[PDB]
């Protein structure tokens, strides 16, 4: 019996205005209706025909077919009154089936965001739904949890307030496998907070003039997306590096600052891209968006004139690199990069590409490939503000200085490249990290944390990168497991409430030790670290040793007798993966020709100057990559544990990159390895809300004005009185030592009431304010008149 919904609202709102048809309300008699297996639906509707002990006969309420399955392969169905629910934690039946079902429906109906107890699921639409707009922003602004439907803008506001309420920093962590939308959902959270919390200069979809800084806070992400994102067999615009954005608020609740902690930038691909994959967007953008003039200015020959672009020039669906340029060019300006300050950041790109043309053909005479062609490095050295001859020698004949010797030597064709290669390759990273601090230079008591890590990805060649990436992914998940089941139950113990433990069986510590732990049973990273510092050792040598230590690790497994490639497997949470240990020691060391290194360190070109200005760590003969990372990633894991987590579990619908297509089991597993169900049991089982004896007799005393006597009284007891005063059911709450533990919703209703008990007064007061606020601003226009 409710309002009518615009075709659009039907995308975030449930259609409930219909007739109370008793068709379903009558069919209920087929009570024998249950859920059961389906090699094509994951589960499907059917009704019991005959219960025969451990087994039972049933007929598909679908194919009319009659099949009998074990009396344990069937799953209770939820009433018709639950169709397309908002909070799974509501349906009177929790199942891998129902939970799936619900998600399936809402999904096809056009709604992707759904609540699951505390955290919330979010199946990628892959389509341009219309549920993000100034219009919708203001709809959710201030709106409680229930005063509106599950939507991202909601999680954002729920946190942003929670922060200002109990004064305690927060985090919004987007999980989900690669592609599931970890990124987008982040861009929104900022999008929302950029208007809902910004301060205004006084004063339709995106139509709105934001503050001065929020302006930039907005144009940042579209920059890092350039030199940092690239097309892959899993995502046309994949985030090629974890990212943790930090937004800073004052006491009044306004945005004032913003930091960005970038992580594992897979800059490898800057030299060679896999099949049907691309390099960092910006590259293509430049080779195309390049202006005729500036075109030559950086020696930007067309596509396929550069060898760092495997698969030549591959195109991206629905995206036009041509314009893409300006967009980012436009961004850079918004951000702050000086007119020329950019032109530069561009040449340094072409440079990172030309350095790829440079050749070194073997020499069967001396056996030290040479520079049969100048043009190549000829150009390259120009963009570097350095010199040819020097570069050349340095690049070919390393006038190095090992230990107590000026060991002057000359490398082999290969080495001649492994350098010119791993040089440009690192010259790149020197850029990202630079911009990032240029961006972070403008964007910069409370902070909101948004985490966009790279999602579990697992292609053909499972290199090192993929190892730390799927490592973090395993890492993060475990965080959710801790804070969700482990931690929560400890406090139940602490406060000493009537509670018994529950083992949700959700731990991956093991699979972390196998790759994290150092001394004692070493971790995959450990070995590859030291074994990386010993001559008679090779990736192979490594692996073999790898088998030595781990070997029988419950989470380890040996390859398909391809130690030729020498690969290993590890049982992640998202599944098994066969990594190729090859070239791991090299990457893990990150070496490079210091000759040319320092050569630049004082180059004529200032930009390249300051870029390299810090070369003291180069290798010409300190800390290991795996531990350099693994060290900062503990810094991150540290603050997160010091903030309040808000999980937004993204979920991939299909691998066909198809919209409207939703693979049952693929989505069934995700809900399995992510801990959704369990993640909901405790929300129903335990008491996810708690409040200390003082704040309780404080907020809701207005409800029982005569429960507590005029005299003083012990916080606890004194407030237990007013609990009897509300005749609260002894199953909703749980009194503890210092705080009370309530059940879901119990506190919400308590809040509602209180807000009602005071509305009028507010109404009353509000008036006098408009009064006061008025007589004054009128008696103001009077001065400009009397002026």
């Amino acid at each position: 019996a409710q309002k009518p919904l615009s075709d659009d609202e039907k995308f975030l709102f449930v259609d409930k205005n219909f007739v109370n048809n008793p068709l379903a309300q009558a069919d209920w008699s087929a009570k024998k209706l249950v859920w059961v297996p389906s090699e094509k639906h994951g589960f499907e509707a059917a009704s019991i025909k005959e219960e025969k002990g451990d087994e039972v006969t049933v007929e598909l309420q679908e194919n009319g077919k009659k099949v009998t399955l074990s009396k344990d392969d069937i799953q209770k169905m939820n009433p018709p009154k639950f169709s397309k629910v908002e909070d799974m934690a509501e349906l009177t039946c929790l199942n891998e089936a129902s939970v799936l079902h619900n998600l399936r429906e809402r999904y096809f109906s056009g709604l992707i965001y759904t609540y699951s107890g505390l955290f919330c699921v979010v199946i990628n639409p892959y389509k341009q739904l219309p549920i993000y707009s100034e219009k919708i922003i203001d709809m959710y602004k201030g709106k409680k949890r229930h005063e509106m439907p599950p939507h991202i803008y909601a999680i954002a506001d729920t946190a942003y307030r929670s922060m200002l309420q109990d004064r305690e920093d927060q985090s919004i962590l987007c999980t989900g496998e690669s592609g599931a939308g970890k990124t987008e959902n982040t861009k929104k959270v900022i999008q929302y907070l950029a208007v809902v919390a910004s301060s205004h200069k006084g004063k339709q979809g995106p139509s709105f003039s934001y503050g001065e800084l929020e302006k930039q806070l907005l144009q940042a992400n579209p920059i890092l997306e350039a030199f940092g994102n690239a097309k892959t067999v899993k995502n046309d615009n994949s985030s090629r590096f974890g990212k943790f954005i930090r937004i800073n608020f004052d006491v009044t609740g306004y945005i004032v600052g913003a930091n960005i902690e970038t992580y594992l930038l897979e800059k490898s691909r800057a030299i060679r891209q896999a099949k049907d994959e691309r390099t960092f967007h910006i590259f293509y953008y430049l080779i195309a968006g390049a202006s005729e003039q500036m075109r030559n200015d950086l020696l930007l020959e067309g596509f396929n004139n550069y060898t760092f672009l495997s698969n030549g020039h591959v195109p991206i669906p629905a995206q036009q690199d041509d314009e893409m340029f300006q967009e980012t060019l436009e961004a850079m300006t918004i951000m702050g990069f000086t007119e020329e300050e950019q032109t530069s950041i561009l040449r340094v790109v072409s440079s990172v590409l030309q350095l790829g043309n440079i050749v070194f053909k073997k020499e069967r005479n001396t056996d030290q490939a040479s520079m049969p062609d100048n043009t190549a490095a000829q150009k390259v050295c120009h963009l570097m503000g350095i010199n040819v001859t020097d570069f050349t020698r340095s690049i070919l004949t390393p006038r190095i200085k090992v230990g107590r010797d000026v060991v002057q030597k000359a490398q082999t064709k290969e080495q001649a490249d492994f350098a010119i290669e791993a040089l440009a390759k690192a010259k790149f990273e020197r850029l990202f990290r630079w911009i990032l601090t240029r961006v972070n230079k403008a964007l910069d008591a409370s902070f909101l944390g948004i985490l966009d890590i790279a999602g579990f990805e697992i292609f053909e060649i499972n290199s090192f990168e993929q190892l730390c990436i799927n490592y973090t992914n395993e890492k993060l998940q475990q965080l959710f497991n801790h804070t969700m089941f482990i931690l929560e139950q400890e406090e139940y113990q602490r406060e000493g409430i009537e509670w018994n433990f529950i083992d949700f069986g959700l731990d991956l510590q093991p699979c972390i030790e196998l790759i994290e732990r150092p001394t004692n049973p070493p971790g995959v990273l450990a070995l590859l670290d030291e074994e990386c510092w010993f001559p008679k050792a090779t990736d192979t040598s490594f692996v073999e040793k790898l088998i030595q230590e781990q070997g029988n690790h419950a989470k380890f497994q040996k390859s398909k007798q391809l130690k030729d490639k020498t690969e290993f497997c590890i049982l992640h949470y998202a599944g098994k993966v066969t990594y190729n240990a090859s070239a791991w020691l090299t990457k893990n060391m990150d070496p490079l020709n210091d000759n040319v290194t320092s050569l630049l360190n004082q180059s004529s070109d200032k930009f390249v100057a300051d870029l390299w200005k810090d070369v003291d760590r180069i290798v010409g003969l300190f800390r290991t990559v795996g531990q350099l990372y693994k060290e900062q990633l503990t810094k991150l894991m540290t603050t997160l544990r010091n903030t309040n987590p808000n999980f937004v579990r993204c979920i991939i619908p299909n691998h066909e990159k198809r919209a409207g297509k939703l693979d049952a089991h693929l989505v069934l597993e995700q809900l399995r390895c992510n801990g959704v169900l369990e993640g909901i049991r405790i929300c129903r089982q335990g008491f996810p809300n708690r409040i200390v004896f003082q704040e309780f007799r404080q907020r809701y005393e207005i409800l029982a004005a005569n429960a507590i006597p005029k005299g003083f009284m012990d916080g606890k007891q004194a407030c237990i009185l007013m609990i009897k005063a509300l005749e609260l059911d002894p199953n909703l709450y749980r009194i503890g030592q210092s705080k009370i533990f309530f059940r879901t919703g119990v506190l919400a209703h308590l809040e509602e009431e209180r807000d009602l008990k005071i509305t009028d007064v507010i109404i009353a007061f509000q008036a006098q304010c408009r009064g006061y606020l008025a007589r004054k601003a009128f008696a103001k226009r009077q001065q400009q008149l009397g002026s």
Binding site: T252, G253, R699, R754, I762, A764, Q766, Q768, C769, F778
Partner: protein, 148 residues
């Protein structure tokens, strides 16, 4: 209303027309009543406006002679707020009997309950009463709008 004031009322009413016909858009009625030291709630104003509609509330006009009859009708009312209760309500948002509420929580309530105000409205109000910790002392803020 003694002619003495009635005579001045005109001075106030007149002091309210951007163009010049001598008409106060059905909207302005509120502020003009306020400016005359009136604190009519949002309803008390519509009730004596025949409950028009947004659109026509920006078209319809008023002339003192037809306005005056309302100024009074309001002027004489049944109740009014007062420190006594006024603050008694805000003191319910006093996180911990400190005697002060966060200029953000106050800023909320005021724009999410009853006659919902605007983000700017509240800004202009509390603005300058928040301390280092952005803490406002209602007791005072109360008196401010009041005695003011």
């Amino acid at each position: 209303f003694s002619e003495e004031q009635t005579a001045e009322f005109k001075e106030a009413f007149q002091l309210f027309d951007r163009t010049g016909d001598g008409k106060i858009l059905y909207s302005q009625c509120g502020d003009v009543m306020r400016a005359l030291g009136q604190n009519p709630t949002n309803a008390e104003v519509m009730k004596v406006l025949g409950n028009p509609k947004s659109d026509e509330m920006n078209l319809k006009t008023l002339k003192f002679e037809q306005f005056l009859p309302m100024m009074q009708t309001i002027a004489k009312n049944k109740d009014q707020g007062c420190f006594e209760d006024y603050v008694e309500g805000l003191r319910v948002f006093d996180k911990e009997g400190n005697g002060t509420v966060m200029g953000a929580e106050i800023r909320h309530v005021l724009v999410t309950l009853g006659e919902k105000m605007t983000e700017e409205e509240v800004e202009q109000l509390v603005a300058g009463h928040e301390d280092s910790n952005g803490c406002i002392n209602y007791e005072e803020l109360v008196r401010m709008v009041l005695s003011g």
